[PDB]
């Protein structure tokens, strides 16, 4: 049993998009189908459902009145017509098969079993991204050590790499002369479509008056590099 999704790309808010899921190696005309979505990196969220012949349609309230599910059994294809996209609609969209096998019992179909609401087969899915953001470089801010670190122990200093698009971004410290007191974290998808991440290094506190610390950010998609010096400050 195979489900293959398509249609998912980057798109702007307010505009529209049509997703498609082609199914094979089973009687597509005998099973209901569902669209389920998963925003990164969160949980699953049921979007829409349809019965085998398309007489019974179901939509979540998140999308009622702007998304429309449909199917063409003559072409074994499921469709999700999304309109009025939002940043909140940004997610990975899975095509999922309904468990229940259905045939018409009385004559649209007057009497039927209906969908079961159980998703036995899924299909890897297609990514839908909603952002009004064109390519742009990051702003880099210093994450300065605690003031209460003078002498004695250790200190965490980092830099905040904010508001860039798309991925990826890389971060090094002192041009690679400093490689481990170091954590560089994954990015977050802010509501503005722009991405943000942080990189932090832990060092001795005595070194915070002699050794200069610089984070080197590289953002190739926008042909930008930024070097930021991280001072203790007062």
């Amino acid at each position: 049993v195979q489900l293959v999704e398509s249609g998912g790309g980057v798109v702007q808010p307010g505009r529209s998009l049509r997703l498609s899921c082609v199914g094979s190696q089973f009687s597509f005309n005998r099973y209901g189908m569902h669209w389920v979505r998963q925003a990164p990196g969160k949980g699953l969220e049921w979007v829409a459902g349809i019965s085998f012949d398309g007489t019974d349609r179901y939509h979540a309230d998140n999308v009622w009145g702007r998304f429309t599910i449909s199917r063409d059994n003559s072409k074994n294809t499921l469709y999700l017509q999304m309109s009025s996209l939002r940043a909140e609609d940004t997610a990975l969209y899975y095509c999922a098969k309904d468990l229940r096998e259905d045939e018409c019992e009385e004559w649209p179909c007057r009497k039927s079993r209906g969908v079961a609401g159980v998703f036995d087969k899924w299909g890897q899915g297609t990514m839908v991204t909603v952002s009004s953001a064109s390519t742009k470089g990051p702003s880099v801010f210093p994450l300065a050590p605690s003031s209460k670190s003078t002498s004695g122990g250790t200190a965490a200093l980092g830099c905040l790499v904010k508001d860039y698009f798309p991925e990826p971004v890389t971060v090094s410290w002192n041009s690679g002369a400093l490689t481990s007191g170091v954590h560089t974290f994954p990015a977050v998808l802010q509501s503005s479509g722009l991405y943000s991440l942080s990189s932090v290094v832990t060092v001795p506190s005595s070194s915070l008056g002699t050794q200069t610390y610089i984070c080197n950010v590289n953002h190739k998609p926008s042909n930008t590099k930024v070097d930021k010096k991280v001072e203790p400050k007062s």
Partner: protein
């Protein structure tokens, strides 16, 4: 409405684990429940349907039960391949801005000693404030198992708007890391005495606090 599950459960290989799914009432209390498994870089997989029935190909280790408004998934003889996310679901829970799927739960097959997170909280830089922006940064490093709950507070008050949190990610030393950001206006930032980042992990919560200078 929601089907609430535990954020995480953990056990050594061979031991047994159980996962709960609590709702009502109008959903679980009067309807069938299904359970789905999702490993990191793959699509979900049906484990249980109609509360306790397994589809073909699913090991007998996975069992399901259901009592009142709570459903339960059970895994005996934990194997390394059982490490994944688990979600409960009911077709009834779509009917009022409610979510069909649970929250859900991360299952961890223990393969190293547990480690508590190192939490670091940074206030907004003066340079960002001069740009008329404020971003609080909470960094959580070197913890295992790789599951944390992050919550923000403004003085004594809870915060949920302006918050974004990353999924835990495997560091080089086989331990996990995560970060949470709280985006803010300098007015909001200055309006409170302090802001706090609360990280919860394995029966412990560490709260770090920062305040305007």
């Amino acid at each position: 409405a929601v089907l609430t599950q535990p954020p995480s459960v953990s056990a050594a290989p061979g031991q047994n684990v159980t996962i709960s799914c609590s709702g009502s009432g109008s959903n679980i209390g009067n309807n069938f429940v299904s359970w789905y498994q999702q490993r990191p870089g793959t699509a979900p997989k049906l484990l249980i349907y109609e509360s306790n029935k397994r589809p073909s190909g699913i090991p007998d280790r996975f069992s399901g039960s259901k009592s009142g408004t709570s459903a339960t998934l059970a895994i005996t003889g934990l194997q390394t391949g059982d490490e994944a996310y688990y979600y409960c679901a009911t077709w009834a829970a779509r009917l009022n801005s409610a979510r069909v799927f649970g929250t859900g739960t991360m299952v961890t097959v223990l393969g190293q000693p547990k480690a508590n997170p190192t939490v670091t909280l940074y206030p907004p830089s003066s340079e960002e404030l001069q740009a008329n922006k404020a971003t609080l940064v909470c960094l959580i490093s070197d913890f295992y198992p790789g599951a944390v709950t992050v919550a923000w507070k403004a003085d004594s008050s809870p915060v949920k708007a302006g918050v974004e949190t990353t999924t835990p990610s495997k560091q080089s030393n086989n331990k996990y890391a995560a970060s949470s950001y709280l985006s803010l206006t300098p007015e909001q930032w200055k309006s409170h005495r302090s802001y706090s980042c609360q990280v919860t992990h394995e029966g412990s919560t560490v709260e770090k606090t920062v305040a305007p200078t």
